[PDB]
Amino acid sequence: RVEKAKQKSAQQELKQRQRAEIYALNRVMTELEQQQFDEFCKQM
C-alpha cells in the first residue's frame, strides 16, 4: 500500500547499497584498466 512504498526493508536497502558499491568500484577499476591500456598503446 501507501506505507510500504515509503521505506524499503533493511534487506532491500542493503542489497541496493551493495550494488551501488559494486558499481562505484567497477567504475574506478575500469578506469584503472583503461589507463593501463591507454598507456601501453602509446608505449608501442
Partner: protein
C-alpha cells in the same frame, strides 16, 4: 588472478571482505580508494536496465543488438570478483537458472557469464543457432582465455559476448563463413598486440528449456602457432559444414 563468488547470493561476509582486500592491493590508491566507497554517506544508485523483450518489429539483428546492449549496460566486471559462478560442464538447465539470477541481481559480468546470458536470452528464437567460440591468446608475457557466443542464422555468422576490449565481443551477422568471423577476431587480437595460440569451436546449444546436457566447448581445437591461415580456413570450413548438416 581473480576471485569467484562461490557463496551465491546474498554474498557472504568472507567473499565481500575478500573483494575489497583484493582491490586494495591492485589499485595504487589502495585503502584510500576502498574507504572512499565503503565509508561514503551516500552512493549513486545505478539505473537497472530492463531485460530485453522481443517485439514483432525486431529483425534478428535488432534482437541481437538489444541483447548485446543489455550485457554492455551490465558492464564488464573489473572488480576482481566474478559475481556468478559458472561451472561450464554443468547441465545447461542449471546454467540457465544462473542466467536468470544475473538478470535479477543486475551486476557486472565477464566473458563466460556473458556466453551463458546470451544463450538464455536467445533461447526463445529457434532460428538463431548459438555455439561457443574460445581463444587462448598470449599478451605481454601472460596467457589469456576468452570465450564468446558464436551466432549462425540464415547463412551468416556473428557473435555476442563481453570483453574488456570493444573488438573482442559482439560482431555483426554479416560474416559469410565461420572462418571470416574467426579471422576477424584474430585480426582484432593482433591490433591489441595479442598472439592467438588456440581456437576452439563448440557445438550448437539446444534451445529447449530444460536441457540436461552440458555445453560442448571444444568439438574442434586448433593449435595455430605453426598453422598457415589457409589451413586454419580449411579446417574451420569443414567443421562449419558439418555443423550445418546436423
Amino acid at each position: 588472478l581473480f576471485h569467484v563468488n562461490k557463496s551465491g547470493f546474498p554474498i557472504d561476509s568472507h567473499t565481500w571482505e575478500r573483494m575489497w582486500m583484493h582491490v586494495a592491493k591492485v589499485h595504487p590508491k589502495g585503502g584510500e580508494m576502498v574507504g572512499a566507497i565503503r565509508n561514503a554517506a551516500f552512493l549513486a544508485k545505478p539505473s537497472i536496465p530492463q531485460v530485453p523483450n522481443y517485439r514483432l518489429s525486431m529483425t534478428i539483428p535488432d534482437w541481437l543488438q538489444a541483447i548485446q546492449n543489455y550485457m554492455k549496460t551490465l558492464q564488464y566486471n573489473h572488480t576482481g570478483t566474478q559475481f556468478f559462478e559458472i561451472r561450464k560442464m554443468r547441465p545447461l538447465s542449471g546454467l540457465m537458472e544462473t542466467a536468470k539470477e544475473m538478470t535479477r541481481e543486475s551486476l557486472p559480468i565477464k566473458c563466460l557469464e556473458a556466453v551463458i546470458l546470451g544463450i538464455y536470452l536467445t533461447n526463445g528464437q529457434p532460428s538463431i543457432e548459438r555455439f561457443p567460440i574460445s581463444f587462448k591468446t598470449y599478451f605481454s608475457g601472460n596467457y589469456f582465455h576468452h570465450v564468446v557466443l558464436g551466432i549462425y542464422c540464415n547463412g551468416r555468422y556473428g557473435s555476442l559476448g563481453m570483453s574488456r576490449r570493444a573488438e573482442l565481443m559482439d560482431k555483426p551477422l554479416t560474416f559469410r563463413t565461420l572462418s571470416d568471423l574467426i579471422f576477424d577476431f584474430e585480426d582484432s587480437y593482433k591490433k591489441y598486440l595479442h598472439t592467438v595460440k588456440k581456437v576452439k569451436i563448440g557445438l550448437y546449444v539446444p534451445h529447449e528449456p530444460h536441457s540436461f546436457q552440458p555445453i560442448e566447448w571444444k568439438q574442434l581445437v586448433l593449435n595455430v602457432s605453426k598453422m598457415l591461415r589457409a589451413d586454419i580456413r580449411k579446417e574451420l570450413e569443414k567443421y562449419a559444414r558439418d555443423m550445418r548438416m546436423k
